[PDB]
Design brief:
The PDB classes it as rna binding protein. By secondary structure, this protein is α+β, with helices and mostly antiparallel strands. It has five helices and ten strands, in the order H-E-H-E-H-E-E-E-E-E-E-E-E-H-H. The chain has a six-stranded mixed beta sheet, with helices on both faces. A two-stranded antiparallel sheet has the order 4-7.
């Protein structure tokens, strides 16, 4: 059922993450980390302190899909265990909520009021998604049998 996920998302902010490289998303999915450019890093740190949950919704450029979504469990931090990103910032710890794909053909009815009411798939890396549109987008993803929401729910309290 959706009660658990709706609780996680109740007071959430949502950001589109656009990656040019599937490899960095694979790395991020396995290790539970993300890094971004300075403007977006600042935005995400502010959001982490302002909302009960900050959700990153990932899309690899030219893939036609979202690849999953995750919740920040920390602000960005420097000097920690270095993440060997594939090069084409601080490291955010993230807990994945869904690592399964959602094709854009399943989100075509959703438009983001904070991006001129364009379809939610459209946006630059870091585009913020308004609460209801982001919630509905996250609810479209299929259940991920590899993920247990329990850890996230305990972290919010």
């Amino acid at each position: 059922g959706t009660s658990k996920l709706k609780y996680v998302l109740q007071d959430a902010r949502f950001f589109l993450i656009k990656s040019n490289n599937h490899e960095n998303v694979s790395l991020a999915k396995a290790k539970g980390v993300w890094s971004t450019l300075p403007v977006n890093e600042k935005k995400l740190n502010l959001a982490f302190r302002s909302a009960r949950s900050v959700i990153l919704i990932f899309s690899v450029r030219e893939s036609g899909k979202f690849q999953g979504f995750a919740r920040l469990s920390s602000e960005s931090h420097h000097g920690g265990s270095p993440i060997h990103w594939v090069l084409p910032g601080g490291v955010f710890k993230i807990d994945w909520i869904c690592r399964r794909e959602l094709p854009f053909t399943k989100s075509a009815h959703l438009t983001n009021p904070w991006n001129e009411h364009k379809p939610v798939k459209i946006g630059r890396d870091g585009q913020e998604i308004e609460l209801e549109c982001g919630t509905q987008l996250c609810l479209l993803f299929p259940p991920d049998e590899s993920i247990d929401l329990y850890q996230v729910i305990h972290k919010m309290r």
